[PDB]
Amino acid sequence: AATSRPERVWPDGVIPFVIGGNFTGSQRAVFRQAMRHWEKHTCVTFLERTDEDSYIVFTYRPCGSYVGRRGGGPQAISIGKNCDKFGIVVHELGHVVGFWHEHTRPDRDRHVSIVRENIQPGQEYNFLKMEPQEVESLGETYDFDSIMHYARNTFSRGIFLDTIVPKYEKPPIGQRTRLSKGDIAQARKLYKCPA
Ligand SMILES: [Zn+2]
Ligand SMILES: [Zn+2]
């Protein structure tokens, strides 16, 4: 679910950043590891902010991110003890780079079923598709292994009640260990990375 909006693509892949206060040294090291992971695989670069008007801020705040470059000022990545692991930060940086959740692709109904009977009442909005004008997938197919893909029981009424079920053979969903091959391939196209 790569944004179609050109102004949301950070210029030349440069993403200035600030790390806020109130983190431990270990937490800060994880933020740097997550940035370096993106930099290893794609042409995105993270730059210690000096005077840039628009930048990301790793912000001590409750868990619960703008997609792409908002512009007009800083944008926060909310980090707490329940959402500070490497793979979670890599996912949040996927939002920063320009990705919505994989299940919100306009073509998602070709790939997953949303099991409405199992969604926690009042949490249905989390499963809305992006409008087709908001996403340009760059010719890359739906990626079950994306770091941006929800797990099978996200916002479910029960641990064993799936809210998202792949439609064909089932691929595991919801990994938060590293960027997938598809994430990388698609980020490279979005940022027009040299190859
Ligand atoms: Zn997310
Ligand atoms: Zn994708």
Q: How far is the CA of 92 from the centre of ligand 1 (A)?
A: 6
The structure was resolved experimentally with X-ray
Catalytic residue status for 92? yes
Q: How far is the CA of 12 from the centre of ligand 2 (A)?
A: 21
What's the reported resolution, in angstroms, to a tenth?
A: 1.3
3-state SS class at 32: helix
* Buried-exposed string 40-58: b where 16+ CB fall within 10 A, e elsewhere: ebbbbebeebeeeebbbbb
In CATH, what number does 1-195 get? 3.40.390.10
Distances, alpha carbon 137 to alpha carbons 145, 183, 186, in Å: 15, 11, 8
The interaxial angle of helices 181-190 and 25-41, nearest 10 deg, is 70
Task: Give every CB contact of residue 88 below 8 A, 6+ residues apart in sequence.
Answer: 176
Which among 80, 68, 15, 44 has a CA at the least distance from the CA of 179? 44
* Buried-exposed string 133-160: b where 16+ CB fall within 10 A, e elsewhere: ebbbbeebebbbbbbbbbebbbbbeeee
Tell me if 41 is assigned to a ligand binding site: no
Tell me if 149 is assigned to a ligand binding site: no
Tell me if 91 is assigned to a ligand binding site: yes
Q: How far is the CA of 103 from the centre of ligand 2 (A)?
A: 9
Q: Give the angle 187-83-142 at the CA atoms, nearest 5°.
A: 30
Q: Report which residue type is found at 64.
A: G
Nearest ligand (C-alpha, residue 137): 2
